[PDB]
């Protein structure tokens, strides 16, 4: 009885600690996301020059034709907005998978420098999306935006539901392509090909680390194990659903905001162009890496994502 009570105090202590660690890991995911988000947004903003097209059109008011610039502005403004939302979603899922795998590993080792080296490397792989993988996503988005919006005159008046529906159709095309096994675009956008793993580390870590890392071939094998696990998760239909859901929730928050601004101003139909401009202002809100950004807080705290994280954290049979 006494010793049974001692065991139950140990097991309580363990469950308290495991819960404390999970909770802290989830906060660390949100905090790492916010720190990386500027490194991701900058490339996208430079590539999709919504503001430069806007300035050229105004210049003309008072060299591509006006017609050309307006179709270019339509595709690029929507492309940028969905590219942000998809890349953010992929980074969120990516970090939640990475950090939860590692946290579990740590928790087990405790419950029982080379190990730390394989963890450091694994964490480095966020570079790929930040410096390459996002482009594939942008290409896929641009293609799908063309498929749905390419023929629509910017002058045309749409309701917010009509517009939401068009956005949703775009999304369903994107999703069908990026999850399609060719390894999906998701995988190739978040992870380097096998032959480029050492390259990634050489881009992200110094010679001291690389020397220590390469001294023991077990380090490379350990990283391959973590990457296999991670890739396993990324190929899973439930993870795909969650990426889509994050984007969906993003769009929802943005459109709610646009609706409120409209109602405040004065829902009547509005010209497509007006929605392009609205989206562009709201896009700016997705890129804000502030603790007070409620949209990013929401995305990082969705129930499906907690459920996923918890399944990973507790997958001891990996």
């Amino acid at each position: 009885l006494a010793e049974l009570n001692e065991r139950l105090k140990e097991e309580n202590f363990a469950k308290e600690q495991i819960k404390r660690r999970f909770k802290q890991t989830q906060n660390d995911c949100y905090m790492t996301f916010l720190s990386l988000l500027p490194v991701l947004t900058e490339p996208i903003y430079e590539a999709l020059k919504v503001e430069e097209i806007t300035r050229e059109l105004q210049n003309k008011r008072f060299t591509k034709s006006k017609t050309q610039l307006w179709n270019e502005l339509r595709n690029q403004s929507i492309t940028r907005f969905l590219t942000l939302l998809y890349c953010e979603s992929l980074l969120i899922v990516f970090l939640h998978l990475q950090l939860n795998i590692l946290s579990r590993r740590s928790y087990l080792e405790t419950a029982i420098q080379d190990e730390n080296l394989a963890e450091q490397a694994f964490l480095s792989y966020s570079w790929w999306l930040l410096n390459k993988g996002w482009i594939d996503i942008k290409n896929q988005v641009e293609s799908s935006v063309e498929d749905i919006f390419g023929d629509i005159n910017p002058r045309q008046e749409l309701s917010i539901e009509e517009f939401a529906t068009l956005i949703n159709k775009t999304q369903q095309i994107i999703d069908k392509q990026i999850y399609a096994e060719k390894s999906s675009t998701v995988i190739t956008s978040l992870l380097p090909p096998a032959n480029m793993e050492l390259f990634l580390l050489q881009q992200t870590n110094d010679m001291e680390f690389l020397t220590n890392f390469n001294n023991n071939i077990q380090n490379s094998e350990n990283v391959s194990k973590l990457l296999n696990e991670l890739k396993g998760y990324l190929m899973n239909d439930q993870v795909s659903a969650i990426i889509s859901l994050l984007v969906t929730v993003g769009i929802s928050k943005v459109l709610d905001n646009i609706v409120v601004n409209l109602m405040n101003k004065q829902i009547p139909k509005v010209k497509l162009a007006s929605l392009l401009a609205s989206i562009t202002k709201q896009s700016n809100q997705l890129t804000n890496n502030s603790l007070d950004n409620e949209v990013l807080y929401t995305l990082n705290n969705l129930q499906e994502l907690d459920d996923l994280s918890a399944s990973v954290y507790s997958n001891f049979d990996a």
Binding site: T54, W70, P154, R155, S274, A277
Partner: peptide, 15 residues
């Protein structure tokens, strides 16, 4: 072409 003309106003809504 006048469709385009009317569109011109909306350029300012990008500010």
């Amino acid at each position: 072409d006048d469709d385009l003309d009317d569109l011109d106003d909306l350029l300012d809504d990008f500010d």
